[PDB]
Design an enzyme around this catalytic site. Structure first.
Site, mmCIF file in Angstrom:
data_model
loop_
_atom_site.group_PDB
_atom_site.id
_atom_site.type_symbol
_atom_site.label_atom_id
_atom_site.label_comp_id
_atom_site.label_asym_id
_atom_site.label_seq_id
_atom_site.Cartn_x
_atom_site.Cartn_y
_atom_site.Cartn_z
ATOM 1 C CE1 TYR B 50 -4.351 0.745 -0.304
ATOM 2 C CE2 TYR B 50 -4.441 -1.415 0.738
ATOM 3 C CZ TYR B 50 -5.051 -0.400 0.027
ATOM 4 O OH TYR B 50 -6.365 -0.514 -0.369
ATOM 5 C CD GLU B 52 -4.230 5.060 1.398
ATOM 6 O OE1 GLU B 52 -3.715 5.041 2.533
ATOM 7 O OE2 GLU B 52 -5.462 5.143 1.220
ATOM 8 C CG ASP B 195 -7.853 9.914 -24.387
ATOM 9 O OD1 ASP B 195 -6.798 9.257 -24.474
ATOM 10 O OD2 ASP B 195 -8.927 9.412 -23.998
ATOM 11 C CB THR B 221 -4.127 3.500 -22.541
ATOM 12 O OG1 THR B 221 -3.852 3.681 -23.938
ATOM 13 C CG2 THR B 221 -5.602 3.714 -22.289
ATOM 14 C CE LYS B 224 -6.421 2.534 -25.907
ATOM 15 N NZ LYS B 224 -7.549 1.812 -26.532
ATOM 16 N NE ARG B 230 -5.626 -4.590 -20.989
ATOM 17 C CZ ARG B 230 -6.016 -4.280 -22.223
ATOM 18 N NH1 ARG B 230 -6.885 -3.296 -22.426
ATOM 19 N NH2 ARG B 230 -5.536 -4.955 -23.260
HETATM 20 C C1 LIG Z 1 -12.729 0.008 3.774
HETATM 21 C C2 LIG Z 1 -11.895 0.366 2.579
HETATM 22 N N1 LIG Z 1 -12.481 0.469 1.329
HETATM 23 C C3 LIG Z 1 -11.722 0.795 0.222
HETATM 24 C C4 LIG Z 1 -10.359 1.014 0.376
HETATM 25 C C5 LIG Z 1 -9.451 1.403 -0.762
HETATM 26 O O1 LIG Z 1 -9.488 0.567 -1.885
HETATM 27 P P1 LIG Z 1 -8.340 0.861 -2.981
HETATM 28 O O2 LIG Z 1 -8.017 -0.426 -3.698
HETATM 29 O O3 LIG Z 1 -7.112 1.380 -2.271
HETATM 30 O O4 LIG Z 1 -8.839 1.920 -3.942
HETATM 31 C C6 LIG Z 1 -9.777 0.925 1.625
HETATM 32 C C7 LIG Z 1 -8.312 1.208 1.755
HETATM 33 N N2 LIG Z 1 -7.644 1.574 2.837
HETATM 34 C C8 LIG Z 1 -6.214 1.398 3.003
HETATM 35 C C9 LIG Z 1 -5.883 1.124 4.455
HETATM 36 O O5 LIG Z 1 -6.790 0.994 5.283
HETATM 37 O O6 LIG Z 1 -4.714 1.039 4.833
HETATM 38 C C10 LIG Z 1 -10.536 0.594 2.733
HETATM 39 O O7 LIG Z 1 -9.932 0.502 3.961
HETATM 40 C C1 LIG Z 2 -8.802 7.391 -26.803
HETATM 41 C C2 LIG Z 2 -9.094 6.400 -25.714
HETATM 42 N N1 LIG Z 2 -9.146 6.809 -24.394
HETATM 43 C C3 LIG Z 2 -9.417 5.896 -23.390
HETATM 44 C C4 LIG Z 2 -9.629 4.560 -23.718
HETATM 45 C C5 LIG Z 2 -9.962 3.490 -22.708
HETATM 46 O O1 LIG Z 2 -9.090 3.396 -21.620
HETATM 47 P P1 LIG Z 2 -9.357 2.140 -20.646
HETATM 48 O O2 LIG Z 2 -8.032 1.685 -20.077
HETATM 49 O O3 LIG Z 2 -9.973 1.036 -21.468
HETATM 50 O O4 LIG Z 2 -10.302 2.582 -19.551
HETATM 51 C C6 LIG Z 2 -9.592 4.150 -25.035
HETATM 52 C C7 LIG Z 2 -10.131 2.790 -25.367
HETATM 53 N N2 LIG Z 2 -10.601 2.175 -26.250
HETATM 54 C C8 LIG Z 2 -10.897 0.869 -26.810
HETATM 55 C C9 LIG Z 2 -10.620 0.808 -28.299
HETATM 56 O O5 LIG Z 2 -10.467 1.834 -28.964
HETATM 57 O O6 LIG Z 2 -10.541 -0.276 -28.874
HETATM 58 C C10 LIG Z 2 -9.320 5.063 -26.036
HETATM 59 O O7 LIG Z 2 -9.280 4.628 -27.328
#
Ligand SMILES: Cc1ncc(COP(=O)(O)O)c(CNCC(=O)O)c1O
Ligand SMILES: Cc1ncc(COP(=O)(O)O)c(CNCC(=O)O)c1O
Lengths: 414, 409
Positions: B50, B52, B195, B221, B224, B230
């Protein structure tokens, strides 16, 4: 693109070195951050697979692109297994994180400006439960609830707040709360004011799957979670929902707030769920609860105080005021002795939020690497030793030396 | 603890997907094959951490080595694109875009983006996406010549006064005039967000115009054409470093995926090499040759040419829908996706076109000759999509190609 030639060491010596040092850091330190764990080699192998190369927008059997036959098998196994784990009517395994899982629910059921209820950050709630600097608190009207004088959840005050502000949705769950949460009582409160109940079980998910912590699934409209932490899976999120919310939830995740899912991570989620279904996992989580209790018991014997007076889970919040040390100072000193914890505000903390009067401790990680009751007690005493003399080099040295004996005896990855 | 031992079902599925990637010629313009070194990085123990916050400014202790990792990723992506600042934590391209929105906008604000019907992305204002449901969207598109209609966009900008203008596309073959778009945005006091997800690899290699000197924000991204893991990245001008970083965390994300960020750093290292520029030169060449070959066979290219990795093929002269073309080509182990053309006479799920891209096939080693052969193989299927003998003959030739050009050796 030859697997014999394209290794991290060959392609990127710097990154190789950093990863190697992090491998050794994970071995040489006792990890007590309650949100951390060590995931299995099988899990890591899955998200290191070629499934990262596949765009699979949509859902199994309902993709936008072709060639998704095998990632469909992967995702459906993940869906079926997590449904089986928690007895959920439906599930979405595409959230990129716990945050996106929660945002998925918000996007599905809410409009910007709606009123929500969540546990305050100051009393153990999470950022995504209504913090003003998080999306949950900046784009929505937040009414927070906290603990009572006994440092248990104040269900009465929460019910009064619910009737007064009439939230569209109530968030339950916590990042730093040691006791069992009464999900049934919260479900009644939400139903009484016509609000949705969303429970964020991220921290307890592993304990719940093993049945050593109450399951929110029969009581909540939505149950969100991380797949890492006590569930001991890869980093990501999952939404569990009642059947009637299957359509808006799936649509909210995609094309609502995400695009192509991380199919390699979804595979790793599936592997983690498979591990979580085993008898060995239940035995692991029983040891998690036991080690946490022993750790809290040991600290109390050494003069520290536990928020809520006890733990009924994997986690505890330690009041440090009796040793005249701040959470920030405690975290630093413990770190020097190779014990990783994090500072955490206690209820009615007299210190600044970045200083605090406490530390949050968890047992999942040390339990995974094989610690039992005896080691848990030793660690508790080692912690107290540092707290009573945080800047004494001789004390830090002695503790660091004993920590070394433990980490050598209980390696994480063999 | 191997997948085979722990989870036989998942193991078999992964093995089947490995074989599928080998046995099919992938022409989906957004797909690529990332390196074993990249995959190894996000398969590392960095998933256990973690972290953050940001390098040197974390909430938790013990982040010394993931700090080195993330800062390497930040520095390298800044160097690749000449960016003043960068955030390498977005979990995806979608989250990268949302990060910018959360940083600079409030719900209900007016934005401009390329219409979905003319090649824009879901996150550029689709009403079923967050970008379009919680914001007022004014879309701009192409002109009669199937180039971006900059005049109409400027008129729309002056009329609707968007707080932010999005540029970039998922299906547009020509060079985008980022300087022109920046002037437009500045004239109405709007932010310009580009983008570049599809073009990022070409841009890094300098074979496609760089939006970074002209835009306030550039999102992408890391997969691509950039050929990484990813995930997403935000590039931003220095004056927007704080609100962007704050929007990613604690705004819309929590703990970053440090194992994926490590994989991002490895991919950026690769993209900085001379080998990568040579790769992207071949990407542009193969896409041009593919488009040229299809034109000789009687097909039409939207915009009349390609200047990048991608093309949108008008299928109407061959009397076949995009839906039918995708199905028939798929049977012959050529992977494409259907795509609506400008003023498409067909329903959205049918379309009159297919989108083709060269990054994946170029990565597995295709050159100009193979690009031309693939073009002819495609045309053969398009001209006889329901002929069993044609599908088999093309499949056999595809099999010959995938065997001589394996993805992973
Ligand atoms: C209760 C609870 N719900 C979501 C998150 C965060 O999810 P994430 O994958 O980091 O976006 C947490 C994270 N907390 C980190 C910690 O407690 O140390 C959480 O506790
Ligand atoms: C121009 C452009 N911007 C964002 C995304 C998607 O990001 P993701 O990681 O999937 O949330 C794309 C995605 N496109 C799929 C495709 O064109 O085949 C994108 O082209």
């Amino acid at each position: 693109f030859d697997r014999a030639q394209s290794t991290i060491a060959n392609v990127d010596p710097e990154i190789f070195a950093a990863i190697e040092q992090e491998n050794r850091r994970q071995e040489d330190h006792i990890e007590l951050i309650a949100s951390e764990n060590y995931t299995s080699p099988a899990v890591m192998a899955a998200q290191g697979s070629q499934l990262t190369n596949k765009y699979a927008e949509g859902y199994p059997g309902k993709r936008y692109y072709g060639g998704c036959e095998y990632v469909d098998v992967v995702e459906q196994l993940a869906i079926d297994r997590v449904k089986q784990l928690f007895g959920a009517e439906a599930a979405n395994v595409q959230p990129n994180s716990g945050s996106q899982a929660n945002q998925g629910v918000f996007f599905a059921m809410l409009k910007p400006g709606d009123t929500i209820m969540g546990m305050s950050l100051a009393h153990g709630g999470h950022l995504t439960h209504g913090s003003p600097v998080n999306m949950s608190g900046k784009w929505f009207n937040v009414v927070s609830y906290g603990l009572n004088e006994n440092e248990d959840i104040d269900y009465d005050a929460a019910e009064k707040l619910a009737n007064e502000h009439k939230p569209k949705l109530i968030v339950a769950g916590a990042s730093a709360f040691a006791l069992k949460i009464d999900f049934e009582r919260l479900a009644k409160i939400a139903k009484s004011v016509g609000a949705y109940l969303m429970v964020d079980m991220a921290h307890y998910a592993g304990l719940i799957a093993a049945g050593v912590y109450p399951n929110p699934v029969p009581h909540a409209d939505f149950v969100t979670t991380t797949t890492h932490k006590s569930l001991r899976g890869p980093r990501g999120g999952v939404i569990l929902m009642k059947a009637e919310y299957e359509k808006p939830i799936n649509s909210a995740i995609f094309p609502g707030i995400q695009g192509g899912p991380l199919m390699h991570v979804i595979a790793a989620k599936a592997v983690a769920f498979k591990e979580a279904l085993s008898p060995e996992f239940k035995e692991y989580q029983q040891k998690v609860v036991e080690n946490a209790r022993v750790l809290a018991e040991t600290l109390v014997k050494r003069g520290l105080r536990i928020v809520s007076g006890r733990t009924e889970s994997h986690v505890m919040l330690v009041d440090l005021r009796a040793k005249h040390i701040t959470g920030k100072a405690a975290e630093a000193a413990l770190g020097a002795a190779h014990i990783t914890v994090n500072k955490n505000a206690i209820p009615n903390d007299p210190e600044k939020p970045f200083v605090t009067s406490g530390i949050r401790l968890g047992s999942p990680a040390m339990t995974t690497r094989g610690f039992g009751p005896a080691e848990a007690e030793q660690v508790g005493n080692l912690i107290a030793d540092v707290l009573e003399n945080p800047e004494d080099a001789a004390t830090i040295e002695r503790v660091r030396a004993q920590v070394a004996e433990l980490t050598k005896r209980f390696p994480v990855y063999r």
